[PDB]
Amino acid sequence: MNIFEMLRIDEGLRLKIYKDTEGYYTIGIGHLLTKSPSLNAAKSELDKAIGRNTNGVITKDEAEKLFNQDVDAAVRGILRNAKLKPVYDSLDAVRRAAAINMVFQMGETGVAGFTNSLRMLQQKRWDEAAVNLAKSRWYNQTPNRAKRVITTFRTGTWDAYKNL
């Protein structure tokens, strides 16, 4: 297991524009197009992202290209953020994947708001962080996904993603 397989499990793959769990226009492997409620806005963003007149449909190769760029962007956002870098740097490789997952889903600013949970992660208080992380809009809105990520922070293993 690695970060790409993990997110592919959590986001799926759809080759036509769809709405994500919050109602926003999305494509591929969780690539957010726009928060605007206009489908025309979303098709404009898609065509700009891909570089061609797509008419709301992309290929599997195009989806995996956006995915590679989004994973790279999530990692670089972590390493540039002063609140996130020291936590990431303190973690083992499996738990680092959990941190990238959260940044991919909710963005760098959103994760840096989990101030208490980040401190507990840095101190390697795993059971305590896991409790604090579940006291969140994130957990109540997407509880199966949040459970898998939290389990990964708590155990440092991939057990939540095996079987799936």
Nearest CA to 101 out of 13, 29, 19 is that of: 29
Write out the residues near Cl ion by the rule CB under 5 A: 142, 144-145
Nearest CA to 94 out of 158, 41, 43 is that of: 158
Q: Which is nearer to Cl ion, 54 or 105 (CB)?
A: 105
Question: Cα(25)–Cα(43) distance, rounded to whole angstroms?
Answer: 9
| Residue indicated by tokens 């449909």 | 57
- Nearest approach in angstroms of CB 142 to Cl ion is 4
Q: Which is nearer to Cl ion, 95 or 145 (CB)?
A: 145
The answer to whether the CB of 88 falls within 8 A of the CB of 99 is yes
20 is catalytic: yes
Among 5, 10, 11, 45, the active-site one is 11
47 is catalytic: no
For 90-118, give the DSSP string: HS-HHHHHHHHHHHHHHHHHHHHT-HHHH
- Nearest approach in angstroms of CB 164 to Cl ion is 12
- Nearest approach in angstroms of CB 76 to Cl ion is 27
Among 20, 47, 64, 128, the active-site one is 20
Q: Which is nearer to Cl ion, 69 or 141 (CB)?
A: 141
Would you name the residues annotated as active-site residues? 11, 20
